[PDB]
């Protein structure tokens with residue numbers, strides 16, 4: 001909207017003209033005539049945008065501004081004569097360029113777009129800190145290093161990827177890392193979660209509808225990557241259509257005849273045994289062979305236990321950022337129990353456990369260690385729970401469980417249990433029977 | 438970038454040149470010479486970008502009318518207009534109507550290349566923020582939402598009070614989003630996380646031999662998460678920001694002017710701190726021009742079922758776990774709990790339930806036994822040989838203690854509504870009242 005802009009030019013009429021139009025728009029404008037006055041203005045306060053004259057030199061100052069302030073957009077002011085240098089400045093780090101003489105509306109528009117893009121990148125950084133959704137693969141283990149090198153090798157190719165690994169191991173993160181290291185890194189990254197899509201709406205989610213517009217995952221993925229997250233959750237009807245899209249890169253939109261042609265790089269994943277599903281007749285053999293082109297195996301947390309301390313530390317920093325809870329020191333006993341667990345939910349389960357620990361100790365002293373007793377049990381019927389029952393039934397269940405527990409406490413000695421609970425021997429017998437013990 | 442670009446211009450010379458330059462850059466370019474050919478091309482496949490002439494002669498709809506039709510069908514599809522020299526008023530009109538930018542005839546190939554790249558980059562960044570990104574029907578939530586709506590368009594300093602995980606930061610972002618600084622930065626300072634020795638450096642930066650949060654927040658909002666953790670020297674410096682709209686960097690005399698709207702929060706008793714001499718009296722009153730209280734989750738138990746459903750849908754989107762049916766037992770337990778970690782704690786427990794039931798029968802209800810000890814052990818449940826207090830008591834005393842604990846827990850669950858509690862526990866309401874009075878609970 002209305003930001004702090006620094007106008008760097010050697011001519012006063014340009015400094016006054018640019019600063020004038022922008023200030024009149026609602027911005028705060030400061031000026032500088034050379035590199036030293038520019039660097040000093042940035043030292044007074046970091047601006048949200050810079051307008052830099054190519055011939056002051058401009059390109060050297062452009063490198064310096066971008067070195068110290070990578071997130072600060074710089075728009076070049078260029079002479080009518082040469083666009084070659086203005087284009088050279090874009091490659092060196094400049095956002096855009098403006099040509100003399102310019103219309104005021106052009107100057108206003110360029111400033112707004114440079115600020116909008118800068119705001120979008122800042123909103124991206126801010127939202128990644130809240131989602132705890134960064135694109136970095138933490139792990140010093142050999143399983144992690146081999147995975148990182150597999151990513152580095154398969155990403156620059158155009159090959160179809162098949163990702164195998166258990167739930168929460170990092171299959172989606174690997175797919176995003178493959179995308180960020182591919183030729184389609186600037187192209188879209190579209191995800192299809194079969195598990196979280198109703199069967200009655202799968203066709204519409206993948207192919208869209210004929211004519212505000214409902215655009216399917218395949219059309220949205222055109223020129224980029226389509227991530228089929230957990231293919232094993234696709235019904236027979238869905239498996240058929242996917243196979244059919246793989247043969248010709250074409251499909252119809254639901255309700256329509258129009259055959260849309262797409263150009264998509266497919267990355268698939270499974271935490272399931274697909275070859276076994278083929279034997280059970282639940283998964284198509286032709287689909288499997290077409291999706292299983294280049295394999296990428298993401299290791300289980302059980303295959304990289306030595307990474308758990310580094311991951312706990314990494315997750316504690318994310319939650320410190322999200323919640324404002326200071327990171328804690330995990331006790332050697334609690335860490336030993338964590339490192340020994342089988343982790344069916346892998347890293348997603350580890351993060352969830354780290355977050356619960358941080359919530360529970362939020363009030364505690366900083367020097368206090370997180371102890372093994374704080375760890376949950378894994379590390380009756382719904383109709384029978386006391387909280388879900390009315391008073392009489394809830395009272396009856398409590399009475400039954402109390403007596404059962406008191407009997408076990410006295411190791412089956414009914415007469416001593418009776419005496420302690422405040423009952424006569426035969427009355428306890430009749431009560432136990434009436435309660436169905 | 439290898440994008441699908443639709444080029445719409447009535448001039449064949451123009452279409453060929455735009456399609457030619459962009460196709461030579463590595464893009465896939467398509468052309469149309471009127472509205473109907475353009476809409477037929479969009480129907481073939483939605484492009485990633487549209488170049489659109491403002492005029493469009495010999496067409497069913499002109500350039501601005503087609504711009505409107507493209508944006509209606511595809512709101513996130515960037516449209517760059519093609520305009521003639523001296524047509525800037527009509528081009529600026531297209532920007533206000535939904536166009537991303539415009540290119541003025543005649544243009545350099547490198548200019549067209551740069552406009553395409555910038556439009557696509559902005560489109561992609563919007564796609565990221567949409568992918569990554571206040572629930573409750575309670576009067577409490579409705580009052581909070583109408584408080585945000587009222588004070589967000591003002592320029593007044595806010596003091597947000599409430600327990601940890603209740604939604605203070607989310608309230609601050611909601612105020613930011615509805616304020617005149619919504620396009621400005623939203624900078625947070627986690628005071629509980631920063632060491633007292635590094636607090637000044639984080640807020641005010643250092644002289645060069647570095648950029649503080651206040652300098653980053655210029656033009657926007659600075660969110661001071663937990664003001665109680667600020668040292669006395671930091672307190673005096675914030676006071677100068679509030680009164681003088683300026684400060685000095687760490688180890689300097691150099692003035693730094695700032696235009697910030699401060700939002701402060703605390704889960705602590707600041708009044709208790711002023712009484713003890715650890716927090717400045719004048720600073721507290723200046724920080725609390727407009728007080729906003731976020732209610733504890735235990736004070737809005739009505740919203741727990743809605744929050745459970747909202748959090749399930751959110752984890753479904755993140756993890757790819759199908760949302761499940763929470764058993765009446767698990768819901769009764771979740772609703773009755775005190776929640777010292779509030780909405781964060783609730784969310785973390787819903788995620789826990791979805792992680793642990795991943796791969797189980799979709800019909801199978803999520804039961805209360807899956808919840809951890811801090812949830813289950815604070816509420817009525819079947820006793821065991823390990824429950825020292827119950828075991829030390831005889832039958833009548835143990836049954837009376839259970840009655841008291843069960844009724845209180847059910848009351849909590851129903852937010853103190855005795856008529857609703859009576860209905861569930863199997864009593865008439867006056868009978869429940871007489872039973873509570875008799876029990877003295």
Ligand SMILES: Nc1ncnc2c1ncn2[C@@H]1O[C@H](COP(=O)(O)OP(=O)(O)O)[C@@H](O)[C@H]1O
Nearest residue numbers: 136137138166167168169170171172173347348
């Ligand atoms: N190597 C890693 N380093 C850091 N965080 C990771 C790593 N692998 C996964 N995560 C995180 O763990 C969680 C689960 O990972 P995810 O990619 O969704 O796995 P999957 O697709 O196998 O279920 C996510 O929050 C993700 O960011």
Ligand SMILES: Nc1ncnc2c1ncn2[C@@H]1O[C@H](COP(=O)(O)OP(=O)(O)O)[C@@H](O)[C@H]1O
Nearest residue numbers: 571572573600601602603604605606607780781
């Ligand atoms: N009413 C609400 N509806 C949905 N989610 C909420 C609501 N209030 C808070 N949250 C969520 O609860 C969690 C804790 O909120 P947060 O703002 O971080 O609390 P605080 O700042 O008080 O510690 C976050 O995940 C947040 O998005």
Ligand SMILES: [Mg+2]
Nearest residue numbers: 009010011053
């Ligand atoms: Mg000049």
Ligand SMILES: [Mg+2]
Nearest residue numbers: 446447448490
């Ligand atoms: Mg024309």
